[PDB]
Every structure is written in C-alpha cells, then in structure tokens.
C-alpha cells in the first residue's frame, strides 16, 4: 500500500478505566508498526497499539464495555470485533474511517478467554497482517481451582504469512506460527507474536508451583495441539468457562479462536518447552518456554 | 466421465413415510446434478437426490430404517452410510449398481446430528464429489434446555475442490468451503453447498429470541471452528447428545463429519455473520448471515 | 546421512521388569530400520527398538519409571520424553549419544494414553522419521464401564512424508497417513504404520461384543477426525482419563499427540472400516479394518 510506505507508528499504550461497577472505558489505536517476527525480519503490521497481538483487555463478568477505537491508519478502515460480548454486528462492529474515531458499548456477560480482532472486510485480510488479540472475562465466582493456583501468565499463538498476500493468506502454508505472552500483573513479560523472544526470555516460576495459563489460539487459519514438555494438564477449562471442565489432559486441542484456562504443576528445575504439538508450526517458530528455579528468579 | 456429459438430472424429492411406532422408510436417489457452487461455477456434482450436501432426514431414537437407494448414475455404483445406525459396513452399506434398486435396514439407537455419505471406494472420490449430508435423530427425553429455544435451523459446512480430481481431493487446498440450510419446518430455506445464497438470503430471527442450529461439518477433508459473530453459545450438546453438554463457547472445534447442537441468545438488531474462524475457508466461502429484525420477518 | 547408507538395524525387542510395587525399568533402543511403509516402499526409520511407531508400553498410575535409552544409532544423537510422566525436560529428557546409554527416572501420577517421541532438536525431524509411539497408565480405579468391555486393542495414527526432508516436513502434505496396532496381550497384533497390514489382515471381534480401542494420533502434523463405520462410540474418555467422559459420539477430534479411550458395539457380522474421517488422509493410508464374526475367529 503506497500510503504505508515509510510508515512505523510508534506504539500507544492501552487506555482503560472503570466507570461504575459494572462499566468500564476502553480506548484502542489502530495503527500500522514494524514488528521483528522473527530475526531479521520485518513485518509491517496492522496492529491494535502497535502490539500484534494487540494489548491484553481484562474485565469482570457483567462489565458493560464502553469502546473507542481512533483509527491512525492513513487509508485502510479498520473496526473491532469482541468475541467476549453480545452485539449487532453489523451496529456495533463497524467501520471506522483513516483519521476518525468510534465509539461502541456492549455487555460482557460470560467468562473466559475470548479472541478480538478486526470485523473489516476482508476480515482474514485483518487478521493474517496482525489485528488480533485476546479479552479475559473474569468469573464472577471464580474457578474452583483458584486457590491452588501460585502463578499465572497469558499466551497467545497466531500465525504470520507473506507480506499483505491475499494468495497466500487464503491458499499457503504458514512461514511463521508464533507465541507471544501478555502481561496480567507489573513484571510480567509483554511481547509480540515472533519466534524468538519467549526462548531467549522464559517465563519463570517456582520448583513445585501450580501454574495457570490463559491461552487463545488466534488463528487466522490452524488449529493449535497445545502441550507443556515435562508435565500434565492437572485441570482445563475449555474457552475459560468454569463448567468445560477436565482433568489430565496432556494436549488441549483449540479451534481458531479457541481459548483456555490450563493449570499444570512443574516438579523439578529445568527449562520446560511449551508447544503446539503439530511440529510443523512448532518447527517455524511456536515454541516457547518455561524457565523453572529453586526460587523463581533468574 | 463419457457417460456423465451434457447429463443434469433433475432433483428427486426425498420419499419418507414412518411404518410403524419406531420404523420408518426412507428412499433416496443417487443422481448426477449441475449445482452453481459460486458465481458462474457451475460443479456437476455426484448428489443424493440432486442436492448437496442432500436432502435433510429426521427421525426418532430408536426407529429402525428401511432405507432405498435408487442409483440413477448411468456408470458410477453408489452406496449409503447413515452415522446414525448400527449396522454391517460389508453387507448392509454396500454398492447399488447403475439403473438399480437397493434396500437396508438398521436402527438408529442414538440421538444426535450425524453425517450421511456415500460409501463406495474410493470414499474420498464420492464424498468430495458432492455426496454427503446429515440426518438428526431427535433424543427420546429431548434436550435440557428445550424450553428456552425460539427458533431452530440446520447449516451444515463442505469443501469443494477441482472437478473430479483425486489429486486435488488428496493433496491439495480446497477451492471452495461453504455453508448450506436444510428445512426442518414448511417455510425453512432449504439450499445448497455454495459461497453466496445464506449472503443474499440470510436466515431470520427476532430481537431477543435464543437460537438452536443443528450443525455438522461434512468435510471431506477440513475441521471447522464454528463461530456466530456478536454472541456467545450459551449452551453445547457434542454430536448432538445431551450428555456432552458445554456452556458458554464461543467457538465449537467439529471434525471431519462432527456435530453439534449450538444454541445462542441474540440481544440487537443487526446482521450476524455465520463463520468457520478459520478464515482461509470463511474467505473462500463459507460465510453465511442471519438477520434479526424487530418483526423475525423481512 | 552417509553413516546410515546401507544399515538395517534388527528389531530389538523392549524390555521391562517391575522393581517394586510402585516401580517399573524399562530398556529401549534408538536405531535405524528399514520398514515397508505401503508396498513396495522402504522408510529408513529413525525408531525406537525397531519400530515405528514404537514399542506399546503399559504401566500403572503411580508407577515410577526407570528408562535406559541405548542409542544404536552411529551419528545422531537421541532422546525420550514420555507425555505420562513429569520430568524436568532439559535434566531428564536430554540427548544420548551414538553407542551410548543413559538412564532417566520419573513418575507416572496421571491414567490415560500418552504420546512418547524423542525429543532432540530439531523434534520435528525425530518424529517425522518414525521416532513416536504410545504409553498407557492404567487407572487405579479403572473406568466405570470397564465391566461392558469384551475386547480391547490399541491403534496409533501417524504421518510418513518425503525421507528426512525437513523442508516437506514443515511445508508439505503427507505421502502417507497409516493405522499401525500394538499388543496388549498374547496373540494380539503388533504392526507398524503402513498402509496395507490392518486391511489385509484385520483386527477380529465377535459378533455383539463392546470393543474398547485406545488410540493415540501422534502426527506429527495433522489432527485426527477418528470413526468406527457402522457404529457410534458408546463411551470417550477423552486422553484416557476417566473424568473426560462423553456419550455417543460418531467421531472424535483427537489434536497431535492427542489420545482417548473410546468404546463400541458391534452388533452384526462382517467387516468395518476404521478412519479419520477427514478422507485425503484415509485415502492415503488411514483405514484399518476390523472382522467381526460369529465366533471371533477367522
Ligand atoms: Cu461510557
Ligand atoms: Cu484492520
Ligand atoms: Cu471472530
Ligand atoms: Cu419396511
Ligand atoms: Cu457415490
Ligand atoms: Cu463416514
Ligand atoms: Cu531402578
Ligand atoms: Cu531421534
Ligand atoms: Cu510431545
């Protein structure tokens, strides 16, 4: 597109507030950013503030979402498409125009971990250049679980495709399927979905710690076989609702856009390896890892 | 095929009549039938009764079918497998031959929404070529939540490839996937595999009104991501028992010939896409709408 | 790989004793195999013990394992990890050198049927070459339709493609896609994954028997659309463990490395096909065949 040529807009923070018990604001970019999808490879992306996948949203079961979404892009319409929310589609995830603003509100009413992404035609269009992300929905009453759980992170597993190829996009294989990982808390990691990041900077815990993983598989086009190397999913909740619940698990299959809550022990030192178990995408860059200490640290 | 140019075989209307409290007759065509997959792609297809996917069939849990082929292909044998029944693949799915007349029986013991194919080897070849579909077999005690649903349709999801191609069924993309509607009530749309006419003619429903779709992805090659745009499932029953119950799914992963019975509440006017999220497949077809209107009309 | 030109190892039998009555050795072998693949096509497999995929293990919930891998293999380095058992991956899943032996430790504290695969990077090429295989933990308590079941077997699905080309590995279709049986009791099949051996010469069952199969799709690459033709699975313990339990399903969704436990009625004579429903993969290999007769011979 001639009207990105030269165009790296740098990234824009998140803005969120409540504003009643049971509201609260949301404001997005989307915007066009250089992302290294894998080492010495630029992707000029289409992005949610200039992260893909875009920024970590997190609710409460009940919250109505008020959404603003400014479109930077000089060009190309983009909108937003909440799969946590109850809507008109063709109302309340419209358009946006290149320099304008829109403002959107609906109900979160179920928990989970739900896909968002661009509802602009051609969505896959949207999707395959990097506007994607994740919504968690807390439980109202939690997860039965939640008292066993000692650490928590998100992950996210996307695919990357030949540059803004339509071809591609619909017919090819992928060059790239990635993990990225979100930050819940102050300290944790907050990255790009690329090939690398996540095995030079592990995630860390604890010998002995139950960890729970927030995971969605955003797609735009495979399904994910879900495995952490050297444990045992303990418990699995399917699309993070509290009642799909199972028990030793060694894989969770997940739909494009499928979610997860998945909890998992590690028992001894060492760096675990997290993937999805068809190697090919593991092969091309869906490997992450897990870096597990005496004290947690390092 | 020699014997298949110039040949369009007119479409044969399903024959059921029920025989006795839990046995009922069913006779089906095998027939050579032009269908316009996409905009001036005209595929003549291998169909059951000139539809495909084929006609729709319902039936009881516990009914025993006595089942009809009658093959109108002037070269081809077909056969019939029901997923539904319990019965002896080698003497009871077994090939009808050119100009010829076959009957078979066998209970239908479980409720759910089951695929129907041909059988004949190469499987791949009659499958790809256009014959498959789905029969539903209604639970005795019905489902849990019964009560709440408004409104119910079927959909059902197929790839289409390069015409007669076996290497193309076996090695390469699909150039098609689609949505289809098949009629449960007088008034239903009832239409086949193609990219366009759920676009054009979309399903309809009332404000507020929570609706039950009877789905199952008959391949023959691909898994769907079953998703409706702006909504949640509030409720999942697997193959279509009631056993295999989920909640609040915002996507249903199907195999290859996998079922469901989704259900889902619809809170604003508006058109709501229909997709397989894995948007390769949504771009080359398989989008489907439904329009919800004050009325449930226009 | 020029150190491999010409060599055949022999099939080396597995070994394994119980040291206690929650410990287990076992003794495999990594070497090179010629193996028929489909007819009159040799595979120079990476394999366990000569096998591919590999030899059937069976042990019991609790069970520590003590596994010595010697690794016969002249130049290439291998490793095991068991998806049963917990383990630091980077001290208890690591290389063995050619002519080298070593030995690992590690609990299985989870029921249900898992993958086993080397774990040497790049994983990819490990398992595409023939380095898979499955571990059953039997449950303590069992499953609670264990006293319905007649007959039991074990089926794996796996993946050939062009020899040790890591660019088809990541980039292509399969050649082939093949059901290979492993004992579990005297006079049981023991096969590896072809194309041909469970169609010429079946699994056997008798007539009105509930047949249990513990099936495991290992990959590497593709999901598994898993069906009996000519019945509906009864019970699905989904990865084996009993909690994970659905009804009456037609197919099963299995992920890479995803396993289960499914169960069936055969209720008349003959013969039934048994496949992944997503048929450029059967057509490719994925059939296997059971014979069901009046006696349960023949
Ligand atoms: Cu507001
Ligand atoms: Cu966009
Ligand atoms: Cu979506
Ligand atoms: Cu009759
Ligand atoms: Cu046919
Ligand atoms: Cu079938
Ligand atoms: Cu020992
Ligand atoms: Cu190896
Ligand atoms: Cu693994």
Same mark, same amino acid.
């Given at each position: 597109?001639?009207?990105?040529?030269?165009?790296?807009?740098?990234?824009?923070? $998140?803005?969120?507030?409540?504003?009643?018990?049971?509201?609260?604001?949301?404001?997005?970019?989307? +915007?066009?950013?250089?992302?290294?999808?894998?080492?010495?490879?630029?992707?000029?992306?289409?992005?949610?503030?200039?992260?893909?996948?875009?920024?970590?949203?997190?609710?409460?079961?009940?919250?109505?979402?008020?959404?603003?979404?400014?479109?930077?892009?000089?060009?190309?319409?983009? /909108?937003?498409?909440?799969?946590?929310?109850?809507?008109?589609?063709?109302?309340?995830?419209?358009?946006?125009?290149?320099?304008?603003?829109?403002?959107?509100?609906?109900?979160?009413?179920?928990?989970?971990?739900?896909?968002?992404?661009?509802?602009?035609?051609?969505?896959?269009?949207?999707?395959?250049?990097?506007?994607?992300?994740?919504?968690?929905?807390?439980?109202?009453?939690?997860?039965?679980?939640?008292?066993?759980?000692?650490?928590?992170?998100?992950?996210?597993?996307?695919?990357?495709?030949?540059?803004?190829?339509?071809?591609?996009? +619909?017919?090819?294989?992928?060059?790239?399927?990635?993990?990225? /990982?979100?930050?819940?808390?102050?300290?944790?990691?907050?990255?790009?979905?690329?090939?690398?990041?996540?095995?030079?900077?592990?995630?860390?815990?604890?010998?002995?710690?139950?960890?729970?993983?927030?995971?969605?598989?955003?797609?735009?086009?495979?399904? /994910? /076989?879900?495995?952490?190397?050297?444990?045992?999913?303990?418990?699995?909740? $399917?699309?993070?609702?509290?009642?799909?619940? $199972?028990?030793?698990?060694?894989?969770?299959?997940?739909?494009?856009?499928?979610?997860?809550?998945?909890?998992?022990?590690?028992?001894?030192?060492?760096?675990?390896?997290?993937?999805?178990? +068809?190697?090919?995408?593991?092969?091309?860059?869906?490997?992450?890892?897990?870096?597990?200490?005496?004290?947690?640290?390092?």
């Amino acid at each position: 597109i001639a009207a990105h040529k030269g165009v790296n807009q740098a990234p824009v923070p $998140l803005k969120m507030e409540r504003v009643g018990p049971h509201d609260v604001h949301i404001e997005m970019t989307a +915007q066009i950013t250089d992302i290294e999808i894998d080492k010495g490879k630029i992707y000029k992306a289409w992005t949610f503030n200039g992260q893909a996948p875009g920024p970590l949203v997190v609710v409460n079961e009940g919250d109505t979402i008020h959404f603003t979404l400014k479109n930077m892009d000089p060009v190309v319409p983009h /909108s937003m498409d909440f799969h946590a929310v109850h809507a008109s589609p063709s109302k309340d995830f419209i358009d946006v125009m290149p320099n304008k603003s829109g403002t959107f509100t609906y109900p979160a009413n179920k928990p989970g971990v739900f896909m968002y992404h661009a509802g602009t035609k051609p969505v896959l269009q949207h999707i395959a250049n990097g506007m994607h992300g994740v919504i968690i929905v807390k439980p109202k009453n939690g997860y039965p679980t939640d008292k066993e759980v000692d650490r928590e992170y998100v992950l996210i597993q996307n695919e990357w495709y030949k540059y803004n190829d339509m071809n591609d996009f +619909q017919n090819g294989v992928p060059s790239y399927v990635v993990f990225s /990982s979100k930050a819940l808390k102050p300290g944790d990691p907050n990255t790009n979905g690329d090939t690398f990041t996540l095995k030079e900077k592990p995630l860390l815990a604890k010998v002995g710690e139950k960890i729970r993983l927030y995971i969605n598989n955003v797609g735009p086009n495979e399904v /994910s /076989s879900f495995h952490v190397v050297g444990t045992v999913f303990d418990d699995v909740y $399917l699309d993070g609702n509290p009642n799909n619940h $199972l028990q030793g698990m060694q894989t969770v299959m997940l739909p494009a856009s499928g979610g997860a809550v998945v909890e998992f022990t590690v028992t001894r030192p060492g760096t675990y390896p997290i993937v999805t178990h +068809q190697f090919n995408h593991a092969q091309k860059g869906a490997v992450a890892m897990l870096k597990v200490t005496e004290t947690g640290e390092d």
